[PDB]
């Protein structure tokens, strides 16, 4: 537990949030749905690791814990209902977009135009939200059951 056992995970969250960003602009692939709300979840995970790292040290490592706990558990419940809402789409739906500036203080990763094609070829029998649900358990089940 130094600058590594965090700056690795702090890197590991860029090794997803940009992975995702690739899709937006190369494999366009515009959509968002709750996915923007979910981008945020990992920009919460960053904080944790990047703070558990930058100025490690032994006091601040207690802060990093909870924030490395919150936005992961948050992540799950966001990716979960998001997943649910396919294996179980709800007679109503909406197909909306919209909203400190969420929308404003960045365009290229905080804009959300998922105009609902009731189809996604999210690879390997699992949709992105379906993967991301798992990977978020892989941060929640670390944090608690492999740290505190």
């Amino acid at each position, epitope marked *: 537990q130094g600058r590594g056992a965090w700056l690795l995970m702090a890197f590991t969250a860029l090794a997803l949030e940009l992975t995702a960003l690739w899709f937006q602009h190369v494999m366009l692939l515009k959509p968002s749905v709750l996915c923007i709300y979910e981008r945020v979840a990992l920009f919460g995970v960053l904080g944790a690791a990047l703070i558990g790292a930058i100025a490690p040290k032994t006091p601040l490592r207690y802060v990093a814990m909870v924030i490395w706990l919150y936005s992961a558990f948050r992540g799950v419940q966001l990716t979960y209902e998001h997943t649910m809402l*396919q*294996l179980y789409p709800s*007679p109503f*739906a909406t197909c909306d977009f919209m909203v400190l500036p969420l929308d404003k203080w960045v365009p290229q990763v905080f804009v959300a135009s998922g105009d609902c094609a*009731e*189809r996604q070829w999210d690879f390997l029998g699992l949709e992105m939200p379906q993967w991301l649900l798992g990977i978020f358990i892989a941060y929640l089940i670390v944090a608690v059951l492999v740290v505190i």
Partner: antibody
Amino acid sequence: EVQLVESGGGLVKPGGSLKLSCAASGFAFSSYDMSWVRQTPEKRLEWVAYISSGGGSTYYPDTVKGRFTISRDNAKNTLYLQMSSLKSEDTAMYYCARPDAMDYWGQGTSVTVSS
Amino acid sequence: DIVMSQSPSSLAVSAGEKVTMSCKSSQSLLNSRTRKNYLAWYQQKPGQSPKLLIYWASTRESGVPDRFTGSGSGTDFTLTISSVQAEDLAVYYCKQSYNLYTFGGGTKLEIK
């Protein structure tokens, strides 16, 4: 095992008002969603309101949107339908239902609108 | 909205037969992701709250005897009750749950 008993409504005048409560009992209430189905005198079946598990979102057919209000209170385990500007179309039996596809239905409170 | 419309209004049958009434919806009820046909069949006994019978279109519900069967797909559903017991006097309602909730008019299965 799982029960629903809606109640509290008889006759009400046009333009009128009146609120019904489904007393829910015998399942993890705060986890399911809730709906309010009525059945007309023709024996016809119209869905009327839908509230989400955590009171978050509600939905209505355009035929009561504005005049009707599906609240819940998982403190006292009740579901509520608050009817306002009452049309004599609203005249029907009022079931309180449970979805996961209405799988446990109530029994009805009849509500009629007349003078 | 979607319009559900069943035929016929009424059916007679001698106790123990096969009956297959039909529910047709105005709008197709299929998702691209999963063959999932978003139609339910509710039975409703004389002066009773409707009971859930079949969901999704095929799949029966906790304590539905195999005899009620749900076929259908797209805009074209059919409910089929083999070996009609006496305690099967009912109106059978189909519901769509693909976009809001709509019901059919009903089909009265009265016994001979």
